[PDB]
Every structure is written in structure tokens, then in C-alpha cells.
Design a protein around this ligand. Structure first.
Ligand SMILES: [K+]
Lengths: 185, 51
């Protein structure tokens, strides 16, 4: 299972951001809104294949969550689909990026702005977000945003769709990695 | 689902499908409720889950 693949909670489907690790302990990042109120994660709709359980969740304000792997046999690739990921980096205006998500698959575009505030309503406001012209659709939450072999962010949300075009905001992945003391591999 | 606090400029991208009266499966209630507004109130909920 790798970046962009579907993950199932008891409520819905999201996408796996990046496989990360600390010592000998494997995790995976996803969106906070997705880890919020979720305990167990499975790799399929039938919920027969277990991935792990939520180890942290930060949402609103930020938009990242982490899941500890409890599955011992599932392959945990340090990639996004086939794309090898080797480091994480900070987004920059004009940077060219690619998002992979369980619903729309892969789409590319660029970073149009940083430190964006997104207001999802009823007090769910997220701050410090990367704005981009990349589309995304329901299912795609938490999937990766990368640039070449660099990890950049996690899909959080936006407007539009992939048919007519849209704007998607992403959580900086560096923020999550530091919070959890984990790193990409 | 009540779409009165809509519209909203943005939606998270998690998937929990709703089926609209246009026979379109909406990915989530946020997506579904913004469409109701854009439809100017003509679009309704058919049922929860995929169409
Ligand atoms: K969208």
C-alpha cells in the first residue's frame, strides 16, 4: 500500500498520504479530518484487511493525522504509486506539484500561494495551507502532494472538480513530520 | 442533511456518498449541499449512499 491508495475508516474512505517511520515503528500520514473520530483503518471496503489504528489527529487548525501500522505482512512502500519519495520539502510559489488520490488518481499543477486560511464552516478553520491549482474530489483527502521525489503536503480540501478545474489546499507535510518525530523513507 | 449553512467556499475531500435527485452520487454532504445552493434549491436528497 502506498501514497494515494484508499484507506477505509468506519465512516468513509480517504487516501493514504505517506508511509513514514520512527525507529522500527511504521505509520502513515493522512488528513486530520479523516483521522478525527476514527479508530481502526482497513485497506478495503469490505474491511477485512486491517492497516492499523489512529495514533494522532490534528484538526481543525492543522490538517494532519497519523496511523500506526498493526498489520505485519502488508507491504509498506516508501512511494506514491510507483513514484519513489526521498525527502520532504517546503512548498514554494510557482512550484510544480502532483497529487495522487484514491478517487481521481494523479493530477498536476502548481503552488499558487502559501499560508492560506481555509474556512470549512462551523468553526473548522485550517491555517498555514498551501494553495494550488490542482483539482481533487471526495475520496482524495489525505493523499500526497509531491514534486518529483519530494514530499510536500497532504490533501485537505477545496472547490471545483477535476472535470471543470479547481483549487485544492494542502497541509505542509513538514509540519506533520516534525510533530510526530517521524520521517519519510 | 440540512443545507442552510451553505454555501461554503470549500469542502474537505472525504468520501461518504449521498444520492441526489439528479441521480448523481455526491461525494460528501459538503459537495451535496453546495450543489443544492447552485441549483437554487431545486436539487433534493434521494437517499444516503451511492445512486
Ligand atoms: K473538490
Amino acid at each position: 500500500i502506498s501514497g494515494g491508495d484508499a484507506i477505509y475508516s468506519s465512516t468513509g474512505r480517504c487516501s493514504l498520504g505517506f508511509n513514514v517511520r520512527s525507529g522500527s515503528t511504521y505509520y502513515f500520514l493522512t488528513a486530520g479530518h479523516c483521522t478525527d473520530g476514527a479508530t481502526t483503518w482497513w485497506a478495503n471496503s469490505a474491511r477485512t484487511t486491517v492497516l492499523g489504528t489512529t495514533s494522532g489527529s490534528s484538526f481543525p487548525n492543522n490538517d494532519y493525522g497519523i496511523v500506526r501500522y498493526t498489520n505485519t505482512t502488508i507491504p509498506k512502500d516508501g512511494t506514491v504509486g510507483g513514484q519513489d519519495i526521498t525527502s520532504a520539502a517546503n512548498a514554494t510559489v510557482g512550484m510544480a506539484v502532483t497529487r495522487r488520490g484514491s478517487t481521481t488518481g494523479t493530477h498536476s499543477g502548481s503552488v499558487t500561494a502559501l499560508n492560506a486560511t481555509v474556512n470549512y464552516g462551523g468553526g473548522d478553520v485550517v491555517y498555514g495551507m498551501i494553495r494550488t491549482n490542482v483539482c481533487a474530489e471526495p475520496g482524495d483527502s489525505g493523499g500526497p502532494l509531491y514534486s518529483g521525489t519530494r514530499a510536500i503536503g497532504l490533501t485537505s480540501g477545496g472547490s471545483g472538480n477535476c472535470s471543470s478545474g479547481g483549487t485544492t489546499f494542502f497541509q505542509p507535510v513538514t509540519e506533520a513530520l516534525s510533530a510526530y518525530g517521524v520521517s519519510v523513507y | 442533511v440540512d443545507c442552510s449553512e451553505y454555501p461554503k467556499p470549500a469542502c474537505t475531500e472525504e468520501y461518504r456518498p449521498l444520492c441526489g435527485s439528479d441521480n448523481k452520487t455526491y461525494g460528501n454532504k459538503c459537495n451535496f449541499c453546495n450543489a443544492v445552493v447552485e441549483s437554487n434549491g431545486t436539487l433534493t436528497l434521494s437517499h444516503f449512499g451511492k445512486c
